[PDB]
Nucleic acid binder design. Structure first.
Lengths: 201, 203
DNA sequence: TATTTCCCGGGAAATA
DNA sequence: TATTTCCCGGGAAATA
């Protein structure tokens, strides 16, 4: 038995997220408030270190979330015969892909250090000179926008669509609107066009 | 160029490269390809600060395969690269990461479904994908081996191979595969070329 | 391994 | 090199 952070636990990832009745949870939380915690939750380790995935006791975990405890008693499971092999597969599938700005910084360094042409770099990476150029352009964008690219909140084309505005204040404005209204790039491109007619008036 | 045999014990991973994670099965799969035909693409290394010790530049995967095969020696190409060159070679490789082919993913999905007795829905949930995306990959496993190789060798795209499935006859599919390559057909054309061949099945 | 339809961002050709 | 244009396969919603 181990006490683990309530924030570290996530529901069973293969199953759909369960939705419990507030009354049934309150009814369970009142059973914990009276008699205490009686059965610890069962979890395992995720790909990340500080993070656990719930196997059993999702109901009890939710009860202690509402009771606002920082810690929850838990039983860790150390499975290998299948788990470790499958975790290797799922990780080999969900390979961590570098963001536009990450690549842009990588391209910038490679061009500075080894005095390469964009053509030369594009050749090596099996890409078009224009693809390299349009990534490097993103480096001129405001740091808030660059973070949104990294945090994968927006796509490359989203950030590219902001470049024409040229004014950092106008860009960070739309960035928040893109996220809040979940705008696609086609919408984002139009939203820019319309703001460059408000620049005329 | 020049190939030389060096001690497996003398080689260390690329400093600037992040600590790689390889599947024991994928390594064993490579080691068994070396054990059978007795041929390896030689690793690229350089000399360290110490003598008789080499630092790996490329081919960490192949080096690991020969470690498990328990050979004392590994064919290698020495390069006089500076800490900057070595670091940039690590970057360019970290950029041009080998992305898994449709068939590779299909085989991965099939195993994951066999192992954990999961639904396609369940797997799709875990991988953050749509049930249909999982289904349509697994479908490719029914295609002729020539077509499956073309996917792997990246001669055609997933959607190309998917478009062949309706031509339920393996002979008709391998026919179009060659036509897709020869005429450099996109998927839209390949879909039409199939429709037209299912009116030649009527005639 | 169920299949069809089709929207949309990657990314490169065209262009400056 | 930097910028504009826009085609097309990934991949998921819909599934006469």
């Amino acid at each position: 038995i181990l006490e683990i952070p309530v924030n570290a636990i996530v529901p069973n990832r293969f199953q759909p997220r369960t939705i419990f009745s507030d009354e049934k949870i309150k009814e369970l939380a009142m059973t914990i408030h009276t008699h205490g915690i009686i059965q610890p939750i069962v979890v395992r380790h995720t790909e990340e270190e500080g993070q656990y995935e719930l196997i059993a006791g999702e109901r009890r975990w939710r009860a202690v979330q509402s009771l606002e405890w920082e810690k929850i008693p838990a039983i860790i499971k150390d499975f290998s015969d299948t788990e470790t092999a499958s975790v290797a597969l799922i990780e080999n599938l969900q390979r961590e892909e570098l963001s536009s700005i990450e690549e842009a910084h990588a391209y910038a360094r490679l061009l500075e250090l080894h005095d390469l042409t964009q053509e030369a770099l594009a050749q090596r990476l099996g890409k078009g000179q224009s693809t390299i150029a349009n990534k490097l352009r993103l480096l001129k964008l405001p740091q808030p926008v660059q973070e949104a690219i990294m945090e994968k909140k927006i796509t490359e084309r989203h950030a590219r669509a902001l470049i024409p505005l040229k004014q950092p204040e106008l860009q960070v404005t739309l960035l928040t609107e893109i996220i809040e209204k979940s705008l696609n790039v086609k919408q984002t491109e139009d939203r820019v066009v319309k703001m460059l007619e408000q620049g005329q008036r």
